[PDB]
Ligand SMILES: CC1(C)CC(=O)C(SC[C@H](NC(=O)CC[C@H](N)C(=O)O)C(=O)NCC(=O)O)C(=O)C1
């Protein structure tokens with residue numbers, strides 16, 4: 001039975017799942033949930049996922065409500081024995097650790113910045129505060145990449161897919177000029193065919209945020 | 225060599241690891257990092273974990289910087305064939321999904337509330353706003369418990385360990401009186417021998433928060 005993905009492509013964690021789906025050529029039914037219209041509070045969706053969040057995957061009787069679980073599940077099912085979710089324990093733990101960095105640190109900070117803009121309007125956000133928090137994330141990722149060309153090791157893993165969608169979102173606002181390894185990695189990611197799955201949603205998010213927040217991102221910032 | 229855990233027992237994600245260490249009889253070397261003194265920014269610790277967070281586990285050459293990775297790693301190395309981290313794919317994914325709920329939703333919201341107290345003082349926190357956000361988490365967990373005695377199924381898993389430490393922390397402020405499944409589950413968790421590993425740190429957090437936030441929890 002084909003997996004069903006409830007999605008809003010503006011969302012970075014949704015885009016990571018879209019990227020994996022494209023990378024592994026997985027047949028998935030897409031069901032759109034417009035977050036800015038509050039459709040995630042529809043009684044049926046709420047009953048499916050009380051966290052009212054996307055992505056949400058329905059695959060048979062399995063209901064997953066977090067991009068990182070979805071990434072791992074899809075890797076184990078459509079890339080069984082593969083290197084995206086490595087077979088060797090230490091390597092798999094490294095990937096898991098970076099998936100969790102994306103959730104706990106990078107996404108948390110980007111979400112709190114972007115959500116502030118949605119709630120308060122850009123002109124009323126302490127942008128310098130968020131610049132510091134997100135620059136700190138850039139410095140961390142630069143440190144990770146000083147040892148390897150991918151986030152969790154020498155090969156592409158789920159961690160790269162998870163991190164690149166949020167990094168691309170942070171970089172709508174904050175430039176990467178001071179971060180040579182991060183620039184190299186991001187450019188490499190942009191060369192993947194799977195990266196196309198990031199584009200529509202990133203641009204939609206850009207346009208949506210500028211509308212709701214009443215501002216423009218500096219065009220010079222985004223690496224393209 | 226044996227695992228080294230950098231820890232501050234006030235931290236909910238530290239306490240889940242302490243619970244697992246007790247549950248599985250794991251021999252670990254503990255190293256205290258006092259977050260309220262900013263010791264997580266000490267040069268050597270920062271070099272080890274640029275996220276300046278606890279728990280951090282060093283196990284040989286493996287450095288883990290997230291409690292959920294630590295729980296999974298320790299279960300895989302020290303509890304092969306156990307039920308805490310089920311080997312059947314669907315069951316494992318359910319546990320993983322709940323671990324990620326704890327990280328992404330429950331802990332995020334509790335951390336935001338508690339940090340607001342630290343930074344603003346309790347008297348200056350929008351408590352109603354946080355009560356709404358955290359009560360929402362209670363509601364969600366009440367739902368998760370509808371078909372089973374534990375968070376991820378009929379048996380105790382890593383998910384319960386991760387969730388109970390944060391839930392016990394939210395419960396410093398907000399009672400479980402309206403949530404019968406959740407209150408039943410929390411009472412059951414408190415009966416586990418391993419839950420003793422949560423006690424010291426929870427109380428230390430209560431005391432630290434009340435001092436730093438210039439207030440007293442209702443539960444105090
Ligand atoms: C403005 C912005 C960027 C704020 C956001 O946080 C997002 S992402 C959409 C959000 N999804 C999650 O929070 C899932 C995070 C999990 N850790 C994961 O799946 O990895 C969401 O569904 N929000 C809806 C809601 O909370 O009501 C965004 O898209 C907009």
Ligand SMILES: CC1(C)CC(=O)C(SC[C@H](NC(=O)CC[C@H](N)C(=O)O)C(=O)NCC(=O)O)C(=O)C1
Pocket residue numbers: 104232234235236237259264275276277278279289290291292327335338339342
């Ligand atoms: C005031 C309070 C409750 C705020 C907190 O957030 C904590 S928990 C300590 C914190 N640890 C993490 O943020 C790890 C979260 C990961 N997702 C995980 O391991 O599961 C921490 O180290 N903070 C220090 C810092 O950020 O500088 C707490 O203890 C105090």
